[PDB]
Design a protein around this ligand. Sequence first.
Ligand code: NA
Ligand code: NA
Lengths: 439, 439, 439, 439
Amino acid sequence: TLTTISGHSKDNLALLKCLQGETKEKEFEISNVLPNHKMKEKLFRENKLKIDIDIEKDIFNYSRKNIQKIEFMPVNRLISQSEIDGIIGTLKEVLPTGQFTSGPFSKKLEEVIGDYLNKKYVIATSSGTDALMVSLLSIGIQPGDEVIMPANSFAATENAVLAIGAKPVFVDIDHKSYCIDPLKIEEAITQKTKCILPVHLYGKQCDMKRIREIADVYQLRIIEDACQAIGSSNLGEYGDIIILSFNPYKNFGVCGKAGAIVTNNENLAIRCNQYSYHGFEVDKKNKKVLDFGFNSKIDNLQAAIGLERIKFLSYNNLKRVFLAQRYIRNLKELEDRELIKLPRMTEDNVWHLFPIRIINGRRDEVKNKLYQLYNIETDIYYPVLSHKHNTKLVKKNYMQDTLLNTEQVHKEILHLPLHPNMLLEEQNFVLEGLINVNK
Amino acid sequence: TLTTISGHSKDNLALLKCLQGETKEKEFEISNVLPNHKMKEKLFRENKLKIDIDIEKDIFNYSRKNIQKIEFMPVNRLISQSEIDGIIGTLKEVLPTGQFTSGPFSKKLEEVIGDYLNKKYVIATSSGTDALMVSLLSIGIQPGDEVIMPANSFAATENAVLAIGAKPVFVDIDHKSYCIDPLKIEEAITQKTKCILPVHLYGKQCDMKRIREIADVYQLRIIEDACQAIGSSNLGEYGDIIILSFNPYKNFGVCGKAGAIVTNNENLAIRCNQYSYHGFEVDKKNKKVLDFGFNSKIDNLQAAIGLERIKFLSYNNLKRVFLAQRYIRNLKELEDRELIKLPRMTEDNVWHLFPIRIINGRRDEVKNKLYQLYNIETDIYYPVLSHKHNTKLVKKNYMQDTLLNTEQVHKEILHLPLHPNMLLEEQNFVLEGLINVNK
Amino acid sequence: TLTTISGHSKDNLALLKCLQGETKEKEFEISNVLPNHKMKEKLFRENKLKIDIDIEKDIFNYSRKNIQKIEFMPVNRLISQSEIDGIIGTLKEVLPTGQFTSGPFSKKLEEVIGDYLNKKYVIATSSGTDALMVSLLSIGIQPGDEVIMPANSFAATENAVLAIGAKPVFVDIDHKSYCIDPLKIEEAITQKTKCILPVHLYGKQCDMKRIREIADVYQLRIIEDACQAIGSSNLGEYGDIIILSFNPYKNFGVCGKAGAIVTNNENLAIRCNQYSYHGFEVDKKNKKVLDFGFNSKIDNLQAAIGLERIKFLSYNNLKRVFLAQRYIRNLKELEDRELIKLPRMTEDNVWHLFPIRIINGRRDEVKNKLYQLYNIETDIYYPVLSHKHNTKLVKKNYMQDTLLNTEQVHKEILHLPLHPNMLLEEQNFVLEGLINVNK
Amino acid sequence: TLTTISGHSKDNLALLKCLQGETKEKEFEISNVLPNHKMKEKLFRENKLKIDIDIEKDIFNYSRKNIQKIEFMPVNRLISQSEIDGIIGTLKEVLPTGQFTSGPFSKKLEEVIGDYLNKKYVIATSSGTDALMVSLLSIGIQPGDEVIMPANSFAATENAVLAIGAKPVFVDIDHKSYCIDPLKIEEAITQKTKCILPVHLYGKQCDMKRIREIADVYQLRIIEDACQAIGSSNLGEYGDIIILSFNPYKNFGVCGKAGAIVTNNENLAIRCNQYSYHGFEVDKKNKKVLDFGFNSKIDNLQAAIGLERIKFLSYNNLKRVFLAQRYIRNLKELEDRELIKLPRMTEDNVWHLFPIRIINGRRDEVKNKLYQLYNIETDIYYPVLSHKHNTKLVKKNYMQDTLLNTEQVHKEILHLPLHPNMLLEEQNFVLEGLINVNK
Ligand code: NA
Ligand code: NA
């Protein structure tokens, strides 16, 4: 059997299983798409998998290095010297053009992302938050319309809804994946509902087939917040619009803010292009066709940087899967002792963040002791749920919201350090602290 | 008998008069602020003006070059190799830090801008449009509130008002400067008016003392759109908040989108800082104190680029005043012949754009003939007035607006190419075409 | 008229004349060949010459830098940071291939050189000395055969002849160009003559049309030592084989030793290929068809370095012409006073070295005072003529040789610093010292 | 008891026996010379052998890989990522010096090689072939002088002799080591013999004590071709000059061509230094003292590369000895059955190539079936004996040469893949094929 590695999550899992010998005798080709550039250089030779790959020594550079502390996300570790060298090279080409607003690198990155997501239209934006705002306007959202969404996403998700005067309507999450529960969506639909905004939180996809079945009964649009899920196989199959972020701390990021709007719907894509640049007709600066818009296209310079950094995406995603598997397998004893709950390995997760649940009310004690006793930073993405801020909006509108699963899980969740440039010695340091703090 | 060059417009005009021998009674030193870096390196030795400065040869590299065509604003010419070299140098320091959202270059640029503007609080933003939307929300603008503004600015000014649900209320311009007529503001004030939004159009400052006098009577805020007016002496004396743009084609730009909010009002500055990053408390990510916010702070990488490019601001602004003076003196016969009206030299103008008026209905013919017969691109900033776009909004709310001076000037205005790295031979080519087309 | 810049000496002179206004309105495009890469980036935009080029400021970075001493050839100055960044980039590609003997970059550099010289066959070698030795064997030179050559070249030229047991026969140079005098060649031909070996010394071509007329009458081969003359227009038109060197201090260099054999003659090219690699049949390692051979192909790694460095060749050669013209024009007074003789500007010279003659016996005093009094290094390429070394060979075989012009010129020649990364401030320091030492 | 590992072959065998538990009573330390760098880092801590060393897992990364095919010497497998990283690091320091001919890394590598060989003088050259040619000229070889050598070496050995006009005189090999038979040398000496040129073929040393006894009686020089034997204990004890190659596919290589001349004889070292650079006096460029010379010193850039790569030499030599022992032990059945002859383990062999003899005429059958049926490449180093090439020289001078044991062994020899970064799974695949083809 010969498989072409596409650079998405499903084929990364198949490749990992082959590298670890959990596989039938299988052979691999690599697709020559830009998100596979680093993987092809590092792991392939003459379009075949290198025979002498050792994951720990060659991909993770394991050398028994001594580790004394762990930070959750040291941002200097998220960019490699290889990426820097390439970024300097492409900046030497972009800077003399003087093209610093739109330009040819913006168009090229839109084509690359369209090819990678298998979608016809891409509008590269100045942020994922801006992409969401523009996408909501493009489907016709007016002030007062309702948008069904979960209450456990980053603030940007609700903020894009609120900034255009729409109303978040919060629905509880499921019991297995941190994602909006499809079985609770229909009961929140009102005559003001215009959109369902699922979030593919932590890099895991929501159950989109069920959500689309509901949307189609009520003639609702679906805008997917995929800002943490780049690379996830079949992303967007059922969505009207998919939102990406290329923030520098995402699985793929530029060196500043950026994002994208992805869709097969030409009418929505046109309206997104118009709203993302002042309401002007496409390529007609200063001539409005829509009533207003924003200044929200990507910078050409960041698109050039993105075309260099995206070369590392499938390889960095593979490294993330390996780290996730290694946490799951080495922490299983704590789950058998009913002290924690672990995520499961699935083919869609791109492992932007690695959640566990500490049950029996011990999450705060374990988090605090990991730091104070073991010098391990962990974090809680995110520390306050949407309906629990001390804002006038919440106090006037969301005081009767009860989201029982969301609120219970929020007492238990903890995120462990997971970023592709981590050393396995560093993950071992986290693993030993987690074991010791739970003896 | 000594002037210290501050880097602003008044001292640039005084220096140019010295460099041309119009005065010889004065001696110059230059202050060590970052916007003066290039001017000090190029024109001074040991804080004394070089004795052998030839403006044409030393500042404009005049060489009797043979010109064939003129583009209005070729963006490759707006950045110099010295700028590029410095940008590459600073990015080699920034990139290994991985600090691509907030960072220390953001804070340094805020400090440099605050000193240059003599204002206490600076919030560097992701664009001038975002700065304006945030500043309007900071003074409490709610949906339906009215904002008095001219109808001849770039669309961003009205769009920021519309994006947050407020209502532009257009007032006519004066007879002398393209700026809002203070004598027409009071009669547009209603119970719904919350803000006057004057625009310092083309680089020229509005009559802010009179506008403040009206605002105080009616307890209105003033937010100043200064996106074209960086470097203008005494900018912001009377406004609550001043908005800057560092778009790459402004008199000072970065290499992508950026801007700033400038104020002396700590309460406004705090709200602006909160709205510019998701409504979170300052230095407390994930904890909202405002109902929503944007993702609208400057990128640290662009702030780094800004601290390199701003070194050229006073010097490039001096080159602009020299070019503007040259147009005025060499087109005077066309105005003496009542064919055109020229701008006057004033100490506040930074000459972002150079407007003339072609009277007796000839503007279109002159523009077209300059391009077709002389290969000279001129342009009209901006081609459609705010109350004249063919949008649903205009058809619903603005059909009965009549702005007599704005509409008459709009039939006459034409902008001539003016950018600091233009050659004097290029300006001579424009001059010859304008004279020849008016014979 | 439109001219395509080919990257060779004639077009560089035409481009320089245009840049300096010594020609018509002339327009240029640039051939997209590798040796033009840097010129195209630095001087062209949209395949047309940039309008805003100032030679002194943009090409030479003139800034009135203070200079305190001059070295003749500081080797750290012969390689730019831009070249280094590119070399690191291509090394990251070549190193993991493991291909360090012949390989694809060797082949590609042969193709680039073949295109640039307009010759059918190129064998890239481990040095120019090795290229000459192989080429002499390929034409059938046996021990005791004679090779007619000048006596004023680098020792490599004669050494290649001697290393294969052949006999240099020295002929005097002309009175104008430091090159072998065609009118003295015929009288040196004997029954043992097998080759005429003219040297294009200092970057200037010999009179090859006349040398070919003689060679054809006597059915002799011509091998041209062009190791200093890369880029010279029409190089090799009349020669059977042309030898190149890519030593790091040539006008185009790699980062180590390398050279090339260039020819249109397939028989000679095949034998060169075989002699350059152990006498093996082409592509048949370990299978000899010639009696012996050498290990004299280029390293694949150096060929990859060459493909990066050659991008700078036409631009560096243009800088050399400008420096040469500037010496000629600024030292004219000293020739008028009959103190020195200067080279003339010609379309073939690529100005590897810049010779003057100091007459009336003053050369040693001028050289010694330029260093000890003015801190200027000059050099004499080369200090000993071939028939004047203190070796057994000279004592046995060359004691009766009298080369009147070679010997007289050798008492007068002096080479002035000339290399393309020189500052004009540095050349001005040389010019002032030469003027002052000759008052 | 305690052994300090010197980095040579004897100590590697001793260490290997300890790692396998064929010795128990021995403690090891390791010397701090550069060729031990990687072994010390990988196998020692605080200058004591690591306690937990598993040869298969820790040194060969054994992981039950499924093998599909074997190439004899895939050049991409001969350099490691660690080497590449170190090479890029050192070239970032060398490149800005612009020192690409002579320079300080050449001198440092000469020092390192002198210490490793226990010899006083080292001239690092551009290749092993050039080292041999220069060494032959340094001992006074004249055209027509005779050099006794075997007929089964790489063609470079004979070619160096032929290139300077000298005459190879072939002598048969022994019956046990593939080396020149000392008992056949004396009968080949004539009045014209000046040198014995033994070859340490495949990494095995010749019987040098006996050859020196003969050379002294007959007043001959010995130049040892040790181009395949770096690291062999006691190499060159009896030779006048020892020749090394650092070709990239040798046990130690650079990334291009290089080699060395090694001697204790100062007069010979001086003459080698002069001949290697144009015949010039040492450190007096352009002044010849010998009649001619070559352009044959090492490149400073390749010396820098060699100082990085030589760090791996003792460790890579240790892996080779383990592979060779594994072939000997696992193929012994085929030798017991009188199908093949195997090499024997000896303390001097560095196992550059791994020879077996397939007897009863079956060598070609075994080689062809291993490739066609099992996808295993084997090779024959070398396919044509010196006196059998179809050249004019062989037909003129060597048609009556009969070398009975060389010719018989040539019909039986086959080399098995053996390189230090091969997988043990790959060796097992070769083992299984060779056993299966000999059923
Ligand atoms: Na210029
Ligand atoms: Na002849």
